[PDB]
């Protein structure tokens, strides 16, 4: 089968011989084994090789983690892609993404938010709200189905939303997902009016 | 499991698990016997007990 995490560790450790790794190489191999899920052994060998093919044009004495993550993104997403040019519509998209992120953080019973970005890679994607992944749920040891456990858990706090002694039912837990999807339209309606409603905030309303 | 035990002519309970390996699931199993009913005749008392 495809190499697992431990197989990834072994393959990257073998193919990292003869190459200069900056700082502690164990941490770099840990991160590039967490961040290369589904990869094949030849893909890991190529990623290790392509890093050492680099650090010549850039004149870096050693292979480092940000550049390693740069090639990790590159070999499976293609071009790095340019950021959205600054405009009034860009400011509105930033406001919409900020309202969606704030309502996501204020929603009880949700997973922690990793990062909210305005600039992404690829072609047909823009701003995004990325939540924590397996490689984040590992460190802070947490149940994989913690999202399902978030209903009946009491007296906890996730992101900016606290839950007291009364647990959220399944009805209230799933009905709390409608507010982040409606917040994009609600920001435009509250801040601009009916004519301020755009196609940027139209897809979540159809899943509400 | 209690109603399956006290219901007459019901399948024997095999295992009752409530989140067995910290997995969010719960089940009450029954032995899949090849004798007795299979498909011969379904009594209304048997169907009411199952319901």
């Amino acid at each position: 089968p495809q190499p697992g995490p431990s197989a990834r560790m072994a393959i990257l450790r073998y193919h990292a011989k003869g190459k200069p790794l900056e700082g502690d190489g164990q941490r770099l191999l840990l991160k590039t084994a967490e961040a290369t899920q589904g990869w094949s052994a030849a893909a890991l060998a190529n990623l290790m090789n392509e890093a050492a093919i680099l650090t010549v044009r850039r004149n870096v004495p050693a292979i480092s983690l940000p550049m390693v993550l740069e090639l990790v993104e590159g070999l499976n997403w293609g071009e790095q892609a340019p950021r959205i040019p600054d405009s009034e519509a860009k400011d509105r998209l930033a406001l919409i993404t900020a309202a969606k992120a704030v309502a996501f953080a204020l929603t009880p019973g949700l997973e922690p938010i990793k990062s909210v970005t305005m600039w992404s890679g690829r072609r047909g994607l823009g701003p995004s709200v990325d939540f924590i992944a397996m490689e984040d749920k590992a460190a802070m040891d947490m149940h994989p189905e913690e999202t399902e456990l978030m209903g009946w858990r009491t007296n906890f706090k996730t992101n900016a939303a606290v839950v007291g002694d009364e647990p959220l039912g399944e009805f209230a837990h799933v009905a709390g997902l409608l507010v982040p999807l409606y917040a994009g339209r609600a920001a435009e309606v509250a801040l601009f009016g009916k004519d301020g409603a755009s196609l940027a905030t139209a897809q979540p309303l159809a899943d509400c | 499991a209690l109603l399956a035990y006290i219901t007459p002519d019901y399948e024997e309970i095999a295992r009752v698990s409530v989140c067995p390996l910290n997995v969010l699931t719960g089940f009450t199993l029954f032995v899949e016997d090849e004798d007795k009913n299979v498909n011969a005749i379904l009594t209304r008392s048997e169907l009411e007990g199952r319901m």
């Binding site: 697992g4 995490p5 431990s6 990834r8 560790m9 840990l30 084994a33 967490e34 397996m134 490689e135 749920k137 590992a138 460190a139 040891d141 994989p144 189905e145 | 067995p20 390996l21 910290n22 997995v23 969010l24 699931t25 089940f27 199993l29």
Partner: peptide
Amino acid sequence: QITLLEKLQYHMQLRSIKQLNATDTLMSL
């Protein structure tokens, strides 16, 4: 819905990450 196979796979992936750093008979049901 997310089936028990996907749930157990998700559990397995989490466990495998816990093997990578810091270095189950339910499919029938």
